[PDB]
Amino acid sequence: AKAKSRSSRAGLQFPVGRVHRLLRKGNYAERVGAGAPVYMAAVLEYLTAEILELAGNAARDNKKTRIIPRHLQLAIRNDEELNKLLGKVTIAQGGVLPNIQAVLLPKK
Amino acid sequence: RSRKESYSIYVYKVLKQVHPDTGISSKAMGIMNSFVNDIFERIAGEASRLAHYNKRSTITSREIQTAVRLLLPGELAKHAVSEGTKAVTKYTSS
């Protein structure tokens, strides 16, 4: 029979087989279920898709056709859930959000 | 030559799926690689802890789903759970 990738069987773009191998060899459990790598790949694919779509939108609003680390930082820090997920994460060459305290601006 | 075995090609496939005409730089590629590795480690480790707590020796989709509920905030958890359930259901039908 012709070999069908488990990713294609699950309708995914992430490698189900590689995820299964990493789970088995990663010192997590004595055994790994059949659907665990599928679930893991689906979650990872969803997360990367969401971040990539937000970063691509940020790049497009900046009139750029290539995602750079700054666009990833803008995508993450402008989303409260993504910022909470990656609160303790530093992104290289990502800069900081443009934020100036109100009291520092001139009054008149 | 050591076959570093990254996630670059799959992330590029996802990017072309969501933004057909948008490329990505090498630095952003490495950052997204690190993000995928970090999230995989977090979810796998927490699922392993869940399995250990209940005196189970296997990691199933239930452990992964509970891990996803525990570490992802807000609607991120809900949508990741939906995606994982859909993928597992489709895979079971082969």
């Epitope: 779509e53 937000l54 402008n78 989303d79 859930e81 959000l97 | 949508h79």
Partner: single-chain antibody
Framework: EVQLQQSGPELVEPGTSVKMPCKAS????????IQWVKQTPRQGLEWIGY????????KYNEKFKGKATLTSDKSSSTVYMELSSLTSEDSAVYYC?????????????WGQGTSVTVSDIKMTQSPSSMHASLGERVTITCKAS??????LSWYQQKPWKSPKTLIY???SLADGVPSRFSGSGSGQDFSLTINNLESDDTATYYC?????????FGSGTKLEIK
């Protein structure tokens, strides 16, 4: 649990300004954008804009730019909308709806509506109005102009009532919606199907897209039972 309170009807003379609140409770206030939608008998539902209380970020419809101004108050979990220079064609119902920052998410919970009376992607719904008996099958087509990657949602609006979400992401059932409602389609063709009908199902159904920056609604479909 989640509830978005709104003020009552306000009578305003033309040329003045008005403001209505959207006091929200039952959830983490800063995690969800508040989207404002106006509904008129001659245009149907129309998207105005949203505000993100997390970072005060806003985004307005081009045809409502300048006319509407959105503000957020983190202390009281309230969002206000200001209309300046109220022109005669502003006597309509203005809705404030909750929507998460996730792209897959839609306008899930709505305010009751403040009936204010004064003194792009074209989203096409094939069946304008239809009739059905107590247990037949109905199907509503919502062919779109451009391509949207399954960022389509279906809403049910009882007369003189706020719309209720049925389908989001073009296939996913919303919370509390029975499995009788079933969405399908992707790209430019979308469909909403109701298998078993009830007297409750007598309402107007709209399909909303949020794949591109100006969100657009369908013309609606008045569905009548028996």
């Amino acid at each position: 649990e989640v509830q978005l309170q709104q003020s009552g009807p306000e009578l305003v003379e033309p040329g003045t300004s008005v403001k209505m609140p959207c006091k929200a409770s039952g959830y983490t206030f800063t995690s969800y954008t508040i989207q404002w939608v106006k509904q008129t008998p001659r245009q149907g539902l129309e998207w105005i804009g949203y505000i993100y209380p997390y970072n005060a970020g806003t985004k307005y419809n081009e045809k409502f730019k300048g006319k509407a101004t959105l503000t957020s108050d983190k202390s009281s979990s309230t969002v206000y909308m200001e209309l300046s220079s109220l022109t005669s064609e502003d006597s309509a119902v203005y809705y404030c709806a909750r929507k998460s920052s996730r792209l897959r998410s839609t306008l899930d919970y709505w305010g009751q509506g403040t009936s204010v009376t004064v003194s792009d992607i074209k989203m096409t719904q094939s069946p304008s109005s239809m009739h059905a008996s107590l247990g037949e099958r109905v199907t509503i087509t919502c062919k779109a102009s451009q391509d949207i990657r399954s960022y389509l949602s279906w809403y049910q609006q009882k007369p003189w009532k706020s719309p209720k979400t049925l389908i989001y992401y073009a296939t996913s059932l919303a919370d509390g919606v029975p499995s009788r409602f079933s969405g399908s389609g992707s790209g430019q063709d979308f469909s909403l199907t109701i298998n078993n009908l009830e007297s409750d199902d007598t309402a107007t159904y709209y399909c909303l897209q949020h794949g591109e920056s100006p969100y657009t609604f369908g013309s609606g479909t008045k569905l009548e039972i028996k």
